[PDB]
Structure 1
Amino acid sequence: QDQGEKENPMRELRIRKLCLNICVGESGDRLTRAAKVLEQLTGQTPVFSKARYTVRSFGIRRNEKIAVHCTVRGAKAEEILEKGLKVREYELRKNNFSDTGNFGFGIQEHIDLGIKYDPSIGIYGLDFYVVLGRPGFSIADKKRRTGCIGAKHRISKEEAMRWFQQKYDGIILP
């Protein structure tokens, strides 16, 4: 309608960022393999995450590098998400969507996404998370005159699904 056309510029859904995370309870040369996996998939150097507390049953110590993660934005994030949704064959559940307008899924095999298996690398999977947003969402991140994004400008759990079905022709099952 007329309202929809005039709202198309600024009230438009887009992917703010794609968050890729690989968590392995070990350190050392084990997670160095995971870092190269994200390096090949995204073209970006990932960053390691340390354990907040010490848990003996998980075999992790405080301040020990455990996970690797990376954030991808732009058309690169669009293409990496397309590959991950391909593996999941465009199928998500309703519970995969949060009340804040975001969603995520998991891929078990990194090899089948983009690359070929190498003898030195492992068998790690990874986690996808999509942070959806609208144009004026950066005012909560800026330093000078920061503000909240308003109530009607936020994304709900419903319109997140609608964007998934309209763009990727996806299916949501209960």
Structure 2
Amino acid sequence: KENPMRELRIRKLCLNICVGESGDRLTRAAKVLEQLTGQTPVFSKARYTVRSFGIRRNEKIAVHCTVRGAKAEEILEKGLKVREYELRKNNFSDTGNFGFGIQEHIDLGIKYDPSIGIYGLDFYVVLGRPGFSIADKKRRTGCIGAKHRISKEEAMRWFQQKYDGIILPG
């Protein structure tokens, strides 16, 4: 019934670890991300100096990476094992993307290391349909139109259908 060019898919996954400060803690955090993705992450600096947070401008604060394709689908399932396939209702944004967090990275499938710590991280699945890339192309870029967009209800339907997930009414 539905056009095959409308089926939802995962664009990227966008793991993020926001450590407070720079140094060996951030280097260990980037090591955690590399172990999780098989893929070298990138450090992000602080926009502004905030001394209540102890950060300074242009200081390496966090580490993040984006995963696409089969590897993204694998990492998302690992993260959803920790969450027990239970995403709260408000975890879904109005643009059709959702996300969650985990507190310990060990239960993702990575063995503990005495030197490395107890880092948590953020998962943020960005959903899309085929044809979403026209907003990113260089030549003749465009928007996707109203029907082709993803709503919060459609993203929730996709999660319930694909991962047999449970949406708590929070």
TM-score, normalised via structure 1 length: 0.95
The 3-state SS of whatever aligns with 2:28 is helix
For residues 86 and 122 of structure 1, what CA distance do their matches in structure 2 show?
A: 21
The 3-state SS of whatever aligns with 1:98 is coil
Spell out, residue by residue over 1:59-97, the C-alpha distance to the aligned partner (whole angstroms, 9 max, x if none): 000000000000000000001000100100000111000
The 3-state SS of whatever aligns with 1:53 is coil
1:1-150 to 2 correspondences below 5 Å: 7-150=2-145
Identity %: 100
Q: CA deviation at 1:7?
A: 3.1
Spell out, residue by residue over 1:92-124, the C-alpha distance to the aligned partner (whole angstroms, 9 max, x if none): 111000000000000111011111101111111
Spell out, residue by residue over 1:30-85, the C-alpha distance to the aligned partner (whole angstroms, 9 max, x if none): 10000010000000000000000000100000000000000000000001000100
For residues 7 and 131 of structure 1, what CA distance do their matches in structure 2 show?
A: 22
Spell out, residue by residue over 1:132-160, the C-alpha distance to the aligned partner (whole angstroms, 9 max, x if none): 00000000000000000010000001010
| Count of residue pairs the alignment pairs up | 169
Q: CA deviation at 1:8?
A: 4.3
For residues 149 and 157 of structure 1, what CA distance do their matches in structure 2 show?
A: 17
- Unaligned stretches of 5+ in structure 1? 1-5
Q: CA deviation at 1:9?
A: 2.0
The 3-state SS of whatever aligns with 2:150 is coil
For residues 20 and 54 of structure 1, what CA distance do their matches in structure 2 show?
A: 24
Q: Which moved more, 1:111-120 or 1:64-73?
A: 111-120
Q: CA deviation at 1:28?
A: 1.2
- Unaligned stretches of 5+ in structure 2? none
The 3-state SS of whatever aligns with 2:123 is strand
Q: CA deviation at 1:14?
A: 0.2
